[PDB]
């Protein structure tokens, strides 16, 4: 991959692998989420980051995901080249927003797009902090100053408020534990595993006769390696679902979200 | 990737990704196992397979793994290019053997190597059958006739007999279920998931202070999407050895058995 001419965004092409596809021989939504994560990581590395920043390391501050929104029009087939352009932008003292555009490398058409909201927090105390001026000036030089939104639309499905699933749930997948393959290089369960866990409560029949068009996920709390998760789903309708990840014990909420599916 | 000049092997380079590395910032053994699987799938596609032949699809036959043996000297770091050369060979009427060599793309040194044994089976009845001559002649043209072994050694750890773990196990990981990300394009549990499940019973302290050097895994039965697995381990030893066992949580039906060897960092 590489930064674009202006150095205000990054592009990368990926060839879809055999183990990255589902029953329909097209990349899964977890494969796409992994590639978004990878292109965002490469973009940070290309401009001198290594989480990010030098003064942030001194204060033990990290960037965490608060919301992920992914909309797919066409899933790349096994063997296809998909090009992803990503960029970051400042949302004032609230935090940052990272956007993505997925394209077919042969036709150049947009086959999907994603958006994410990140908040600043203390690695140790887990306390959210409002973005400071000295930290803002460090990354602003790598962001476009004019707004560049993957989801520009007036009142789009990416900024909607997600409600809490009421008990009893219609569908459920209980006793979900992460294995070592679910952890990142810092031994934390990465954001993509939560997506897979959310979709575990979706009934197999829906998966077999529908394609996932949209997924909006809110991150409330991190799941420890020794925590057990319950995935809950309810049809709220194309098919719509309301989701909830919570700890198997106390029932402490770790995630909430919505998915939208279209008939094949 | 591409077939080599003679068309009797296939090569492919891979760049190691951020989500593919562990705490050491080097590729995990499941990432390597995924790349071996990928280069073997690309080799079959490059010579006209999908790795079933015309005679096989007609009789509802499939190739299944009976054993996987992986030996790593150096795990590629995040951002490194690793080159993998793979080839297949005939082991008479028993079945086929697929081999791999992993190299550093910068230095050209061998950083690892793998071997696998495959048996022929009816997809529906799950019954093994010996390779027939009409099926053998279909893939023999894509294999070297002279032996080409990644593990040539006289008394190599790849052909050793694996014993069954005796109860009680020293270590265990109970209640392991595969999720949809664990399934392949045909809704079957990926062979790589069994490797991850085997290593779940290895204690975290061993993982933190050791590097996995060898893993030999025997496949006895496939795990259904709605089956629950128990992973069992016992130390059998400078270097640490383990005996492993995957079995169904209910009846205790054996699905996998194996051994791992670790060395101090
Ligand atoms: C996780 N979000 C971070 C926060 C701010 C810095 N940053 C970034 C900006 C431009 C290029 C590379 C990286 C991000 O994406
Ligand atoms: C399990 N091994 C399979 C079946 C036998 C033939 N075969 C292959 C040989 C040469 C090129 C491409 C594929 C395989 O990989």
């Amino acid at each position: 991959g590489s930064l674009t001419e202006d150095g205000l965004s990054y592009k990368e092409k990926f060839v879809v692998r055999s183990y990255e596809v589902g029953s329909n021989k097209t990349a899964t939504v977890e494969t796409i989420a992994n590639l978004l994560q990878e292109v965002g990581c490469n973009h940070a590395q290309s401009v001198g980051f290594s989480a990010t920043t030098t003064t942030m390391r001194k204060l033990h501050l990290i960037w965490v995901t608060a919301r992920m929104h992914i909309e797919i029009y066409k899933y790349p087939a096994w063997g296809d080249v998909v090009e992803i352009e990503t960029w970051c932008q400042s949302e004032g003292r609230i935090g940052t927003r990272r956007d993505w555009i997925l394209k077919d490398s042969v036709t150049g058409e947009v086959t999907g797009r994603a958006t994410s909201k990140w908040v600043m927090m203390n690695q140790d105390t887990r306390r959210l902090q409002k973005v400071s001026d000295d930290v803002r000036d460090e990354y602003l030089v790598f962001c476009p100053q004019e707004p560049r939104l993957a989801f520009p639309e007036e009142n789009n499905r990416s900024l909607k408020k997600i409600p809490k699933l009421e008990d009893p749930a219609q569908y459920s997948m209980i006793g979900l534990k992460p294995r070592r393959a679910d952890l990142d290089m810092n031994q934390h369960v990465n954001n993509v595993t939560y997506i897979g866990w959310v979709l575990e409560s979706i009934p197999q029949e829906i998966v077999d006769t529908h394609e996932l068009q949209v997924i909006t996920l809110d991150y409330r709390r991190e799941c420890q390696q020794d925590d057990v998760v319950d995935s809950l789903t309810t049809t709220t309708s194309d098919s719509q679902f309301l989701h909830l990840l919570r700890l198997s014990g106390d029932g402490q909420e770790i995630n909430r979200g919505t998915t939208l599916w279209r008939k094949k």
Side-chain angles (χ1 to χ4, degrees), chain A:
Chain A
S2 180
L3 298 146
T4 63
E5 203 85 274
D6 61 1
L8 301 179
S9 75
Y10 189 92
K11 291 180 175 188
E12 186 164 10
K13 296 174 210 177
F14 300 94
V15 169
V16 187
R17 304 169 167 182
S18 64
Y19 61 91
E20 293 180 336
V21 309
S23 317
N24 24 41
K25 286 157 204 183
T26 66
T28 63
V29 83
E30 300 181 74
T31 293
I32 306 302
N34 271 329
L35 304 182
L36 304 177
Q37 188 170 255
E38 175 72 359
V39 71
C41 171
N42 286 338
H43 186 196
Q45 240 198 100
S46 71
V47 294
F49 291 113
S50 17
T52 82
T53 310
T54 331
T55 61
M56 256 171 60
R57 290 169 163 197
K58 178 59 74 62
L59 307 179
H60 282 31
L61 268 5
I62 62 175
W63 288 107
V64 298
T65 314
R67 192 174 180 111
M68 173 69 67
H69 173 89
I70 304 166
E71 183 181 29
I72 302 292
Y73 315 120
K74 228 175 188 185
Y75 284 93
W78 154 36
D80 290 355
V81 186
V82 45
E83 181 176 59
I84 315 171
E85 185 189 15
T86 186
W87 67 99
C88 186
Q89 267 218 301
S90 235
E91 305 217 308
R93 300 209 74 179
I94 319 174
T96 57
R97 192 199 65 234
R98 180 177 284 280
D99 290 6
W100 295 263
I101 304 292
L102 287 102
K103 285 189 189 171
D104 190 327
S105 192
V106 183
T107 70
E109 75 194 62
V110 169
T111 67
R113 47 182 111 223
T115 185
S116 67
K117 290 199 192 298
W118 303 70
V119 298
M120 186 114 72
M121 91 161 180
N122 192 279
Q123 167 109 262
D124 321 322
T125 63
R126 311 283 176 199
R127 298 185 64 81
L128 249 76
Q129 294 293 134
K130 162 159 292 187
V131 178
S132 70
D133 36 293
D134 280 327
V135 174
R136 190 120 43 81
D137 294 10
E138 288 176 310
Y139 68 82
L140 249 170
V141 299
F142 314 115
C143 306
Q145 318 277 265
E146 293 180 41
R148 216 212 137 164
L149 293 127
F151 294 90
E153 302 94 40
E154 176 144 37
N155 314 342
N156 39 276
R157 21 181 62 133
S158 73
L159 296 143
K160 256 124 94 162
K161 155 76 190 175
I162 305 167
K164 199 177 181 165
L165 190 145
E166 298 206 344
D167 273 346
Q170 178 181 29
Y171 308 116
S172 88
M173 177 56 64
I174 78 160
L176 290 169
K177 319 177 306 175
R179 51 186 189 108
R180 296 207 193 92
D182 290 303
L183 311 170
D184 65 5
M185 65 190 80
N186 325 108
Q187 296 191 343
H188 289 269
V189 169
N190 62 303
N191 91 86
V192 187
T193 294
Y194 300 98
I195 290 166
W197 283 341
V198 155
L199 302 179
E200 272 307 295
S201 53
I202 293 285
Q204 192 67 55
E205 16 264 290
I206 291 298
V207 183
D208 291 342
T209 70
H210 288 80
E211 281 262 79
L212 183 71
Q213 190 157 15
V214 191
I215 182 171
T216 310
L217 194 51
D218 281 6
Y219 294 84
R220 201 181 198 85
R221 194 153 303 216
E222 286 191 39
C223 166
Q224 311 322 298
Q225 197 200 155
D226 55 355
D227 270 333
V228 177
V229 161
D230 281 353
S231 196
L232 309 149
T233 303
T234 300
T235 308
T236 56
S237 35
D238 281 26
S239 306
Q240 295 217 50
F241 298 93
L242 186 55
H243 299 275
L244 185 73
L245 293 184
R246 75 174 167 201
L247 302 178
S248 231
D250 53 4
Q252 173 72 263
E253 179 186 343
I254 66 129
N255 273 89
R256 81 167 62 169
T258 40
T259 57
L260 173 72
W261 302 69
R262 84 220 164 222
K263 262 174 72 158
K264 298 176 176 179

